[PDB]
Amino acid sequence: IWGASGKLIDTTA
């Protein structure tokens, strides 16, 4: 996950 993957999961890891 880098930035935003879809909508709800927004974490830089």
UniProtKB/Swiss-Prot annotation:
Membrane topology annotation: Single-pass type I membrane protein
Which cysteines bridge via disulfide bonds?
4-10
The record's subcellular location field reads: Virion membrane; Host cell membrane; Host endosome membrane
Highest taxon listed in the record's lineage: Viruses
**What does the record give as the function of this protein?**
Acts as a class I viral fusion protein. Under the current model, the protein has at least 3 conformational states: pre-fusion native state, pre-hairpin intermediate state, and post-fusion hairpin state. During fusion of viral and target intracellular membranes, the coiled coil regions (heptad repeats) assume a trimer-of-hairpins structure, positioning the fusion peptide in close proximity to the C-terminal region of the ectodomain. The formation of this structure appears to drive apposition and subsequent fusion of viral and target cell membranes.
Query: What does the subunit section of this Swiss-Prot or TrEMBL entry state?
Result: The mature envelope protein (Env) consists of a homotrimer of non-covalently associated gp120-gp41 heterodimers. The resulting complex protrudes from the virus surface as a spike. There seems to be as few as 10 spikes on the average virion.
Q: What is this protein called?
A: Transmembrane protein gp41
> What is the source species?
Human immunodeficiency virus type 1 group M subtype B (isolate BRVA) (HIV-1)
Chain's gene name:
env
Query: Which residues of the complete protein does this chain represent?
Result: 591 to 603 of 852
